[PDB]
Amino acid sequence: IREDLDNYLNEMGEVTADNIQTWLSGRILLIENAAQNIAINPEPAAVASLLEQKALTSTFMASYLGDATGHFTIRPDAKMPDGFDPRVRPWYKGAESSSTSTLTEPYIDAATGQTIISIATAAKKAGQSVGVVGGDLSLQTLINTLSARSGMGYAFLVSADGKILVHPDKALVMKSLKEAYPQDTPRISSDFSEVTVDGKTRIVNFTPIKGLPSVNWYIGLSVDKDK
Numbered sequence: 001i002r003e004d005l006d007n008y009l010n011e012m013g014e015v016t017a018d019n020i021q022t023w024l025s026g027r028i029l030l031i032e033n034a035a036q037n038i039a040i041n042p043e044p045a046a047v048a049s050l051l052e053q054k055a056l057t058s059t060f061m062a063s064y065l066g067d068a069t070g071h072f073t074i075r076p077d078a079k080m081p082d083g084f085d086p087r088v089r090p091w092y093k094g095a096e097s098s099s100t101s102t103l104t105e106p107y108i109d110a111a112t113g114q115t116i117i118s119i120a121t122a123a124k125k126a127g128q129s130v131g132v133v134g135g136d137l138s139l140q141t142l143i144n145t146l147s148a149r150s151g152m153g154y155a156f157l158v159s160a161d162g163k164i165l166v167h168p169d170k171a172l173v174m175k176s177l178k179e180a181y182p183q184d185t186p187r188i189s190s191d192f193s194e195v196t197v198d199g200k201t202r203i204v205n206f207t208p209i210k211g212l213p214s215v216n217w218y219i220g221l222s223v224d225k226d227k
Contacts, residue, residue, distance in 0.1 A: 006192065009203065010207075013205055014207055016155045017210070017218075018210075020209060024119075024212060025212075027059060028213065031063070031101065031119045034051070035133040038050060038131070042125070047065050047073050048075065051075035057075065060135035061109075061136040061138055062075060062076055062135070063133065065131050066086025066089070066092055067086075068087065070086065070087060071131075084110055091104050092120070095122050095132045095134070100214055101119065102119070102120050102215070103117060105117065105174070106166070106173060116138055117139070117142065117165075119134065120132055120133065142166045143167075143170075146168075150223070153222050153223030154221075155220065156220040157218070157219060158177065158217065164177065165217065183195070184196060186204040186220075188218065192204065193205070201225040203223050204222045206221075
């Protein structure tokens with residue numbers, strides 16, 4: 001009866017991880033392809049034309065290029081805060097310091113003011129960088145992608161440092177597992193974890209998401225032990 005729940009949780013973990021891996025992978029390729037295309041010709045009119053294309057605008061809230069001079073182009077265009085400097089933003093710093101594409105942790109979007117993640121990569125022509133390209137995805141979008149799937153629990157997204165990145169309870173976003181579950185804290189190091197929450201015991205496991213550049217993230221599954 002309990003060796004069945006365990007097997008079910010492990011398999012649901014693998015399926016959920018694989019699904020979000022394949023969902024992220026096509027988006028990573030769109031941003032990489034934009035960075036490649038920008039590297040062919042980084043003139044601003046040419047950059048603008050690339051970012052305005054439907055495949056990008058229909059997939060991301062926005063995509064943009066920032067460079068080492070502080071120049072910024074974003075499509076769809078948006079009035080940025082006074083003094084905006086892309087060089088000090090988390091998407092930029094993460095990608096500038098990496099030989100591959102990157103994904104950010106959730107952060108506060110400068111354009112909309114809402115919490116987002118970004119896919120970002122350095123655009124390199126002949127080994128020389130011409131800036132960093134990024135694309136934005138809303139927290140709500142990630143929340144929806146994780147909940148498209150289990151009738152007895154929910155999936156969440158947690159980094160390998162134990163920081164909850166995406167969770168249906170928005171108050172737990174960007175809390176550590178310990179801050180979110182101070183008693184009986186679920187441990188990524190263990191197969192299963194039991195925690196009492198809002199009056200019911202739950203079982204939690206973690207599955208690694210394969211094939212994501214730069215990041216080591218997990219799917220968490222949390223299930224009501226009784227049902």
